Amino acid sequence: VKCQSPPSISNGRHNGYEDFYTDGSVVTYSCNSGYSLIGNSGVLCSGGEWSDPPTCQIVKCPHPTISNGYLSSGFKRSYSYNDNVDFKCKYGYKLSGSSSSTCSPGNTWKPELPKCVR
Numbered sequence: 034v035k036c037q038s039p040p041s042i043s044n045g046r047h048n049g050y051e052d053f054y055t056d057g058s059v060v061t062y063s064c065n066s067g068y069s070l071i072g073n074s075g076v077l078c079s080g081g082e083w084s085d086p087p088t089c090q091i092v093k094c095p096h097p098t099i100s101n102g103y104l105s106s107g108f109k110r111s112y113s114y115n116d117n118v119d120f121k122c123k124y125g126y127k128l129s130g131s132s133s134s135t136c137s138p139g140n141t142w143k144p145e146l147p148k149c150v151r
Contacts, residue, residue: 034055034056034080034081035053035054035055035081036053036054036055036056036058036078036081036082036083037052037053037054038051038052038053038054038060039054039060039062039076039078039083039086042062042086042087042088042089043064043068043088043089043090044064044065044068044089045062045063045064045065045068045070045087045088045089046062046063047060047061047062047063047076048060048061048062048063049061049075054078054083055078055081056078056079056080056081057077057078057079058077058078059073059075059076059077059078060075060076060078060083061074061075062075062076062086062087062089063089064088064089064090065089067091068089068090068091069089069090069091069092069113069114069138070087070088070089071087071088071089071090071092071114071138071139072085072086072087072088073085073087074087075087088138090138090139091113091140092113092114092136092137092138092139092140093111093112093113093136093140094112094113094116094136094137094140094141094142095140095141095142096142097112097118097120097134097136097142097146098146099120099128099130099146099147099148099149100148100149100150101122101123101124101126101149102120102121102122102123102126102128102132102146102147102148102149103120103121103123104118104119104120104121104134105119105121106118106119106121107119112136113136113138113140114136114137114138115135115136115137116135116136117133117134117135118133118134118135118136118142119132119133120132120133120134120146120147120149122147122149123149124149125151126149126150126151127149127150127151128147128148128149128150129147129148129149129150130144130145130146130147130148131144131145131146131147132147134146134147
């Protein structure tokens with residue numbers, strides 16, 4: 034079985050390091066300047082069939098806010114895919130949820146923002 038170069042994708046493209054993949058190979062796809070590449074940064078042609086291909090969407094999360102348990106490690110007026118914001122529970126409060134989230138590739142803060150509780 035063989036795996037020719039992968040076809041284009043969601044407004045994105047593919048450019049690994051060859052033009053005749055076969056099996057167990059991978060291709061780091063590319064997204065238009067502005068679209069985030071979601072997935073395992075590399076398609077996976079296994080058995081002559083490309084699989085688990087990444088996406089080319091816009092990863093612009095809202096804001097990693099929370100009940101006083103805001104973050105104090107890396108928070109910018111704007112973020113996108115990654116940018117893990119650590120949540121500093123305001124005062125001796127506990128963060129019910131996750132004290133460390135990140136601007137995922139779906140425009141959000143995963144895991145679910147934390148909750149500063151007592």
